[PDB]
Amino acid sequence: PEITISDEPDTLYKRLSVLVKGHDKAVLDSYEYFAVLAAKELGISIKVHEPPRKIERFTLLKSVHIFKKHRVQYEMRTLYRCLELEHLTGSTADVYLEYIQRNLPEGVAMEVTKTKLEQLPEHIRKPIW
């Protein structure tokens, strides 16, 4: 485990939001238990919610050649879990999200939105042209 300290001022995040998409509920429940218990140990101070499910339904003809009065109806359900972390560092972010991501289940996908804190840019500071 090689650790090194660069003098540069590590990035801050106000809100690290993690979307966990799934088909099944159970896996996301367990994974929630996992991310919660992992973010408690590191004292990351997080919340979790359930964004309402989205269901897509499309229909195919039931027979090879012709009966159009008969249809098969197929379904894809996507269920949500969102982890909301507030007031975290850049390194804490890279580690926690490394640990959370390496173990991510096969049927589930993950979308992360990071709002990162920057003071102001240089040409804007207090010059006027």
Binding site: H23, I55, R57, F58, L60, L61, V64, V72, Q73, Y74, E75, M76, R77, G107
Partner: protein
């Protein structure tokens, strides 16, 4: 071996439509512009007309990948309903279930 001669000619239509693509885009850039002269547009007209019509986008036909069925194709899986249903029913298709509501 591609499963049909159909899929043969359509594959050659994908290669071709990728090849002359730049030519298409740049010619049709002027041809569809109002500000430019009509005279550059008649010549640009003869120009995209000169290209082999096997390289144009709309001559391409979406088919099922494995079974080649020209119609009844589900865009996202590129699969005919026969084969789609077959695959999803064995549960070989992930997430696809029978709809009840």
């Amino acid at each position: 071996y591609y499963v049909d001669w159909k899929m043969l000619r359509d594959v050659k239509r994908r290669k071709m439509a990728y090849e002359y693509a730049d030519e298409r885009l740049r010619i049709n850039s002027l041809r569809k512009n109002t500000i430019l002269p009509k005279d550059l547009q008649e010549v640009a007209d003869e120009e995209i007309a000169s290209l082999p019509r096997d390289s144009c986008p709309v001559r391409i036909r979406n088919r099922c990948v494995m079974t080649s069925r020209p119609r009844g194709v589900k865009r996202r899986w590129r699969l005919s309903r026969i084969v789609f249903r077959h695959l999803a029913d064995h549960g070989q298709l992930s997430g696809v279930q029978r709809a009840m509501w």
